[PDB]
Structure formats: structure tokens, C-alpha cells
């Protein structure tokens, strides 16, 4: 298919260096084989049928217990399975065709499973391998959420609406009230199960602030919103001139621009590797809210810093030729998810148009700083 | 009349649900009509003109016999009247101009009759209606304490001071000595007659520990004093996730901060109603000691729990509007006591300033958990 052509092309057969005694973080159950496959450079690599098989486990392994991470932005549940592996559950807050209204600020946006699903597949198509796997799933919220929690703060919020439907809302801060409830028809809600990274006890994770963090207030603009030479100073700030880091943040901001996800207020790393490893692309629920509007604000880090990874630049050039192209390559996968169609056609169609903006931001920028200054080189 | 405007506002016309055969504790003298008026949700209601007339009894009823509560923290007397009803008497231990010393711990604080009275009016202005009625009264301590007691331990402590005044101190532990005696000029002492709750023979009261109870010694910090997420756990502990209970402690913990009463080590319930009734706001004598100082420790239950009642939030916002305001609304009623002024004016000024801290603590706290999580709604279906 279109997806068969991509993973045979040599740009997706790039192999990583050999792993040392470090670089490891650490026929078992699938959630555990996923943890040990995590190394310094990626989160799973192209092969590894565990990732595909962990997606079947997230879909259909029996939910044994459900708990609620209290005091979050919106509702996120923790599902615990029969085989001791757990997962993060984000439920459906909006339909597929809906867009965030234009008068909403970026911090008033909902977290939607459509982005959670599409972000793992979008990330896997860019051969980043940084998003933990996510599967879509229909959950009988009587048999699989309400009746299998001993967390009465979540059980207490279940009621029956005048429509004889089962509803619930939990306890967060944004949109956890009766008027923002989640209601099945009559008792299934649908949502995204994101596989859980290893417990923080046996795998510490440093939490970083990213330098283009927006001003989570109205009227007050952020530092980069006023200073056009902001990137001349950021290439001389502590940890960001040592990697594989400026190179890795430009990777992520192209990831985010493709989805329109402007909520990248922090990014997490795996500690055991230091300032020179990959960035975990977590909590991607804010993307794919607008498909007829391209948010250039997210891209400003690319027009200001003007440099990409060569691995990721050459792949992007490939994903624009029609014989491969994101849209058909994106709808090709995401067809192996249960919540199909996880992206309505305008979101898949906007992925192509947003892609060619990244390629033009590089071409206008490659003819003002020259090659090599713009394009690194990891093809050796 | 600013007090007239308040009781016309719809926030003071809220009606309760219907009272069943339970919810009454029971199934004439003025003190007895107060007992039978106790129901599940309140202690008297705004209607009940008995309360106003019961305060007249505490002012002018003949004191027939006086006895001393053995083993109290400080001096506390029991007055029994001609009509067999009784009342609790706290004598004047501190003047109107005094403040508690800054180096005093909450457990070294004096209990003063001004607090007993002012807490009753402050509670009535907040439409809580949880404090038993209390009236101030001047007592001829010759004719009304010494010469009408059969308690040798209270009688033995009466003496005449070198200033030819009559003094006495009783037998407690804090401030029951000659050097802390209570002296009229020359034989009137003044104090607060707090009407008596029904006898415990026919009305059991369950006694609860409040979870923000301080560690009543120096050096030792309390449970909540180290853990800012203390109340995330208290809303998951038996009786505090079922009410109308976490919310009822928020009512009380806002009351205490307004008065500065940090000695709320326990609170009482009526049992005959179960875990689903109101909290009797008792023993408020430790409040109104400081008027140039705002004690934030008392408010910690609210900043940690971050949830209040909407009835009680809107009234708090209302009691800050200049056309209502604690100040004028408090000195209005408190002028109906014999001991006018029961509160010195900077204390009424401090009541206003302390209120705006509570309203800002809810505003700063409502913008981090949001409405619906912070403000529960009990005016659903009310004017």
C-alpha cells in the first residue's frame, strides 16, 4: 500500500548506533516488553511487533480497576489491567467534525482522543518514535468504568440524564461539572488508551520548561512574542547547545505544527541519559481541533532558529511527493484503530497543506543561511 | 436601619426543606420554646421572636442559685433562674481596649464575655444560626453570686481588695488566683449569660474532633501544618465525604477566622440527627482578642480544601458591599445588648478587613480549581 512504500524506502531503514551498557533505562506481557525496548535514541524503533501487539492489548485486555489522577487540566483516568500493566484514558469530549471556536484561547482548548490517536500515528510516520502507543477503545462505562473503581470521587459523579443515558464527569478543573459531562448512548463513551511509561520509582524523568512556552494569560505576550532575534540568544543558553537538543526541539515543533497543537508548555526526558537524549512527546490531546486554520504561531521557533535535522528534513521532502504523502499515509494507518475514522478528511487533508508550509519555511530559510547552516547531517 | 435592609434581601429569605417527624429533636417559658425550636438544619431560624425575648430573660430574670462547674479550663458559672431554666455565665476577664499579648499561644488566651456575645450576633448576621443565644448582664456579685451559692469552692474565693472592692476567682487552672481575681468597682462585675442547650439527659450530643485541630503544645507542629495537600485526604475520610459536612466545617472555619478564634479543637453534633445535621458553634470566648492582627492559621482549612457553600459565599460577598457591610450590620445589633459597646470599633473594622481576606481567598482559590469544583450549589431552586 502507500504505507508499504514508505517503510521500505532507505530513509526509514536508517539504523541506530550500537547500544552500550548505558542507553538501556533497564515473552513477557506486551506492556513490559515495550518498557525494556526503550533506549537512548528512540522509544521503540521501526520493527518490534510488540508495539502493534500492545495496541491490541490496550483495545481488548480486560479493565480490572480504574482510578483518577486528581486536579488535572481536564479528565484523565488510569486503567489497570488483569496483567498488571496500566494505561492513561482520555475520553471523547467533542465530535469529529467540530472545530475549536476562533474566539477560544489556546489554554481553553479541550483534550480529545482523536489527536491522542492521530499523534501516535503521525509521530510513527515521521519515524520519530517518541510518542507512547495509544489505541482507541469503546468502553461500557457501566461494566468497565463505574463498577470497577474503588475511587468514590469518580463513582460519585455518575448519574442518569433525562435522556436515560449514563453520564459522568470526575473531578478536574476545566470542564468537570454536570454541564460538561460525558454521556454514552446509552452507556458507551469511547476514548484513547495511552500505554503507560515505566513507574517513576524505577525510571525517573526530568521535566523541562520549553523556551517558547506561551504566556498562559491574555493581553500579556511572552518573551518570544516581542523579541525577533530570540533564537540568537537561545543557542547560547545552558542545555540547548549540547545536543541533539536544538535539533530535537525543531523536530517537536514540526510535529506540533502539523497538528496545530500550541500547548507545548513543557517537555519530559528520561534522566538516565542526561541532557543528550530524546524528548518524550506526551499529552498531545490539544491537536486537530482546527483543520481549516493553520496556526503559524507554533512554527515561529522554526523561522527564528532556522535549522532542522537532516534525517527529518529529507523525510519531509519525501512526504510531499504524491506517491507517499502524509494524507494517504495517515489514513492508511489510523484505519487499524477501532475509533475509525479517527480523523475526518479535512484534518487529514490539512496535514498535507501544513506539511508544505514546513517545506517552504525551510526553502526560504535555506536560501538565506545556506545549506549546512540550515541542514545538519545524521546520514553517516 | 442597615440591619433592616439585610433581612429583606433574598439571601436572607432562603427557606429550608420540609421537616419530617424526625428533624425536630422533640415531639411556656422562653428558654423551653428555644429547645423545641431546634431542628435538623438550624438552631432557631430568623422568625422565632422567642430568641429576642429569651435574651430579655437573660438580662432581667432573677438569679436564684449559682454553682461552679468543677474542672473547667477557666472560670465558668451556671446560673439557674426562677423559671427552672438555666444559662451559662462567663465573667469579664478582659477589658474592651485590651488585646491578647503577641507572645501568647492560642491556649494561653483568655476567654472573654465580649466574644461570647459578639459571636452570637456575627453568626446571626451570617444566617448560620448555630450559636446558642447569649445576652450581656451586670450582676451585683454580692447579692447575685456570693450570697446565692451553695458551692463552698466558689464562696471561699471571695475577698475584699485593698481598694475596698469585692473580688473573687473560683477554682480552675488558668487565671483562678488572687492575682487574676475579678473585681467590681466596687461590687458589679459584668458578664455574658449564654442560654443553655437542652439537658444532655434528653438530648445526646456526639463530640467530633476537627481535623485541623492544632497541636496544643509549643514545638510540635500539627498534621496539616506540614502537608499542603492535607485536605485532599480529609475529603476521603469517613464522615467528611458524605455531607453537608466538609461544607459545614467551611462555614465554621470562616466564622472562626472572622473572630480570630483559633481554639476550635472539637465541635459538637446532635446525634439524634446523625452525620447529616449542622455544627453547633460553641465556646467562642477565644475570639475577638486581637483587632490589629489577622490570624491566617485559622483559614488554612479553607485554602487547603478549596470549597465553600454558595449560600455562604454570596452572603460573604454581600456582607462586603458597602450598603450592607459587617461593620454597620454588627454595631447595629450589638447595640441591643446592655453591655454596649460589646465590641470596640476597631474590632468591627477588623471584621471588615478579615472578611475581604476570605473573599479573596475564595477568589484566588476559585481560579485554580474553578467554579463547580469550589462552590457547591444549595440555592438550586431558591429565590
PDB file of N, CA, C and O in Angstrom, chain A residues 70 151 153 156 171-174 176-179, chain B residues 232 235-236 241-243 368-373:
ATOM      1  N   UNK A  70      -6.168  13.182  40.254  1.00  0.00           N
ATOM      2  CA  UNK A  70      -6.895  14.370  40.705  1.00  0.00           C
ATOM      3  C   UNK A  70      -6.205  15.681  40.334  1.00  0.00           C
ATOM      4  O   UNK A  70      -4.980  15.761  40.217  1.00  0.00           O
ATOM      5  N   UNK A 151     -12.482   4.293  43.786  1.00  0.00           N
ATOM      6  CA  UNK A 151     -12.187   5.704  43.973  1.00  0.00           C
ATOM      7  C   UNK A 151     -13.549   6.380  43.920  1.00  0.00           C
ATOM      8  O   UNK A 151     -14.028   6.775  42.856  1.00  0.00           O
ATOM      9  N   UNK A 153     -14.500   9.232  44.484  1.00  0.00           N
ATOM     10  CA  UNK A 153     -14.666  10.585  43.963  1.00  0.00           C
ATOM     11  C   UNK A 153     -15.117  10.539  42.507  1.00  0.00           C
ATOM     12  O   UNK A 153     -15.771  11.472  42.026  1.00  0.00           O
ATOM     13  N   UNK A 156     -18.932   8.668  42.486  1.00  0.00           N
ATOM     14  CA  UNK A 156     -19.966   9.579  42.958  1.00  0.00           C
ATOM     15  C   UNK A 156     -20.481  10.512  41.865  1.00  0.00           C
ATOM     16  O   UNK A 156     -21.570  11.076  42.021  1.00  0.00           O
ATOM     17  N   UNK A 171     -13.415  14.761  38.609  1.00  0.00           N
ATOM     18  CA  UNK A 171     -13.020  15.928  39.406  1.00  0.00           C
ATOM     19  C   UNK A 171     -11.704  16.476  38.842  1.00  0.00           C
ATOM     20  O   UNK A 171     -10.619  16.071  39.265  1.00  0.00           O
ATOM     21  N   UNK A 172     -11.816  17.396  37.885  1.00  0.00           N
ATOM     22  CA  UNK A 172     -10.647  18.130  37.415  1.00  0.00           C
ATOM     23  C   UNK A 172     -10.870  19.610  37.711  1.00  0.00           C
ATOM     24  O   UNK A 172     -11.361  19.949  38.793  1.00  0.00           O
ATOM     25  N   UNK A 173     -10.513  20.504  36.785  1.00  0.00           N
ATOM     26  CA  UNK A 173     -10.868  21.907  36.985  1.00  0.00           C
ATOM     27  C   UNK A 173     -11.565  22.501  35.764  1.00  0.00           C
ATOM     28  O   UNK A 173     -12.637  23.102  35.885  1.00  0.00           O
ATOM     29  N   UNK A 174     -10.999  22.289  34.574  1.00  0.00           N
ATOM     30  CA  UNK A 174     -11.665  22.702  33.346  1.00  0.00           C
ATOM     31  C   UNK A 174     -12.579  21.582  32.872  1.00  0.00           C
ATOM     32  O   UNK A 174     -12.102  20.518  32.462  1.00  0.00           O
ATOM     33  N   UNK A 176     -15.223  19.817  34.397  1.00  0.00           N
ATOM     34  CA  UNK A 176     -15.624  18.692  35.242  1.00  0.00           C
ATOM     35  C   UNK A 176     -16.818  19.120  36.092  1.00  0.00           C
ATOM     36  O   UNK A 176     -16.721  19.279  37.311  1.00  0.00           O
ATOM     37  N   UNK A 177     -17.952  19.304  35.423  1.00  0.00           N
ATOM     38  CA  UNK A 177     -19.213  19.653  36.054  1.00  0.00           C
ATOM     39  C   UNK A 177     -20.315  18.901  35.327  1.00  0.00           C
ATOM     40  O   UNK A 177     -20.079  18.258  34.300  1.00  0.00           O
ATOM     41  N   UNK A 178     -21.528  18.969  35.877  1.00  0.00           N
ATOM     42  CA  UNK A 178     -22.659  18.285  35.256  1.00  0.00           C
ATOM     43  C   UNK A 178     -22.915  18.796  33.841  1.00  0.00           C
ATOM     44  O   UNK A 178     -23.270  18.020  32.946  1.00  0.00           O
ATOM     45  N   UNK A 179     -22.727  20.097  33.618  1.00  0.00           N
ATOM     46  CA  UNK A 179     -22.982  20.714  32.321  1.00  0.00           C
ATOM     47  C   UNK A 179     -21.900  20.424  31.289  1.00  0.00           C
ATOM     48  O   UNK A 179     -22.070  20.789  30.121  1.00  0.00           O
TER      49      UNK A 179
ATOM     50  N   UNK B 232      -6.864  17.043  50.558  1.00  0.00           N
ATOM     51  CA  UNK B 232      -7.114  16.039  49.530  1.00  0.00           C
ATOM     52  C   UNK B 232      -7.420  14.689  50.164  1.00  0.00           C
ATOM     53  O   UNK B 232      -8.165  13.882  49.596  1.00  0.00           O
ATOM     54  N   UNK B 235     -11.128  14.834  52.570  1.00  0.00           N
ATOM     55  CA  UNK B 235     -12.356  14.633  51.815  1.00  0.00           C
ATOM     56  C   UNK B 235     -12.551  13.180  51.400  1.00  0.00           C
ATOM     57  O   UNK B 235     -13.507  12.879  50.678  1.00  0.00           O
ATOM     58  N   UNK B 236     -11.663  12.282  51.833  1.00  0.00           N
ATOM     59  CA  UNK B 236     -11.757  10.859  51.537  1.00  0.00           C
ATOM     60  C   UNK B 236     -11.897   9.987  52.780  1.00  0.00           C
ATOM     61  O   UNK B 236     -11.955   8.759  52.648  1.00  0.00           O
ATOM     62  N   UNK B 241     -16.940  13.047  53.518  1.00  0.00           N
ATOM     63  CA  UNK B 241     -17.288  12.979  52.108  1.00  0.00           C
ATOM     64  C   UNK B 241     -18.764  12.700  51.900  1.00  0.00           C
ATOM     65  O   UNK B 241     -19.169  12.379  50.781  1.00  0.00           O
ATOM     66  N   UNK B 242     -19.578  12.788  52.944  1.00  0.00           N
ATOM     67  CA  UNK B 242     -20.995  12.493  52.795  1.00  0.00           C
ATOM     68  C   UNK B 242     -21.892  13.717  52.860  1.00  0.00           C
ATOM     69  O   UNK B 242     -22.957  13.718  52.243  1.00  0.00           O
ATOM     70  N   UNK B 243     -21.493  14.744  53.608  1.00  0.00           N
ATOM     71  CA  UNK B 243     -22.300  15.930  53.801  1.00  0.00           C
ATOM     72  C   UNK B 243     -22.198  16.891  52.635  1.00  0.00           C
ATOM     73  O   UNK B 243     -21.752  16.505  51.554  1.00  0.00           O
ATOM     74  N   UNK B 368      -8.138  28.410  40.592  1.00  0.00           N
ATOM     75  CA  UNK B 368      -7.208  27.298  40.448  1.00  0.00           C
ATOM     76  C   UNK B 368      -7.887  25.935  40.459  1.00  0.00           C
ATOM     77  O   UNK B 368      -7.304  24.978  39.932  1.00  0.00           O
ATOM     78  N   UNK B 369      -9.072  25.801  41.049  1.00  0.00           N
ATOM     79  CA  UNK B 369      -9.896  24.623  40.822  1.00  0.00           C
ATOM     80  C   UNK B 369     -11.149  24.942  40.026  1.00  0.00           C
ATOM     81  O   UNK B 369     -11.883  24.017  39.661  1.00  0.00           O
ATOM     82  N   UNK B 370     -11.409  26.217  39.741  1.00  0.00           N
ATOM     83  CA  UNK B 370     -12.608  26.594  39.018  1.00  0.00           C
ATOM     84  C   UNK B 370     -13.866  26.493  39.850  1.00  0.00           C
ATOM     85  O   UNK B 370     -13.893  25.775  40.855  1.00  0.00           O
ATOM     86  N   UNK B 371     -14.910  27.223  39.455  1.00  0.00           N
ATOM     87  CA  UNK B 371     -16.248  27.001  39.995  1.00  0.00           C
ATOM     88  C   UNK B 371     -16.635  25.537  39.824  1.00  0.00           C
ATOM     89  O   UNK B 371     -15.903  24.763  39.196  1.00  0.00           O
ATOM     90  N   UNK B 372     -17.780  25.150  40.388  1.00  0.00           N
ATOM     91  CA  UNK B 372     -18.305  23.789  40.311  1.00  0.00           C
ATOM     92  C   UNK B 372     -17.439  22.850  41.141  1.00  0.00           C
ATOM     93  O   UNK B 372     -17.963  22.014  41.886  1.00  0.00           O
ATOM     94  N   UNK B 373     -16.117  22.953  41.009  1.00  0.00           N
ATOM     95  CA  UNK B 373     -15.240  22.268  41.948  1.00  0.00           C
ATOM     96  C   UNK B 373     -15.136  22.992  43.286  1.00  0.00           C
ATOM     97  O   UNK B 373     -15.007  22.340  44.328  1.00  0.00           O
TER      98      UNK B 373
END
